[PDB]
Amino acid sequence: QATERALGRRTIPAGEARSIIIRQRYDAPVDEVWSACTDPNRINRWFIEPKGDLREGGNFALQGNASGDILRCEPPRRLTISWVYEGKPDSEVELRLSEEGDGTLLELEHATTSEQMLVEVGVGWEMALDFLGMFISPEMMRISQERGEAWAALVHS
Numbered sequence: 001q002a003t004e005r006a007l008g009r010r011t012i013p014a015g016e017a018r019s020i021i022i023r024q025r026y027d028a029p030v031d032e033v034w035s036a037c038t039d040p041n042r043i044n045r046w047f048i049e050p051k052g053d054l055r056e057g058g059n060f061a062l063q064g065n066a067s068g069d070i071l072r073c074e075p076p077r078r079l080t081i082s083w084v085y086e087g088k089p090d091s092e093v094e095l096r097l098s099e100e101g102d103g104t105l106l107e108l109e110h111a112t113t114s115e116q117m118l119v120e121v122g123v124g125w126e127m128a129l130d131f132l133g134m135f136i137s138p139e140m141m142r143i144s145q146e147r148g149e150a151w152a153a154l155v156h157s
Contacts, residue, residue, distance in 0.1 A: 001026065003023060003024045003129070005020070005022060005023075007118075008021050012090070012091070013090060015113045018112075022107070022125055024133070030076050030104045033097055036135060036136060037097075037106075037132070046132050046135035047128050047132070049062070049063070050062055054070065055073065068081050072094075076097060078096050080094045081094075088117060091117065108125055108129070118151065119148055122147070123147045126147050
């Protein structure tokens, strides 16, 4: 519907990280959004499907690098996973879904000790959450570039 970006702070294996925090409200209920964000036959519609044992302490790979472990899984609310990528320090991503009336307030936070990687990931999730939204690159470069300025400017100070 309409997104509020923010910055947090976390202690992850790679150390003290800051974080991207994306908040979006959806007019679907918590379950449906949980399923859409966790059932690989639904993640497959709007994003890249994960492979491996999708269960807690299990692990995931997405077709084009990124892989990681499934640290926490508290259906239908919370989801934490590690995030490993070739040239990159290790990261952590978390999804919290909360009820707001008949709908849900999604929250997606990706923490990383790399300042460069803050922007890159905030923007990368936002692009992806578009297709979640839909599900529930010339024009795209422009949207990538504005969104980058927003995260870049928030990361400044």
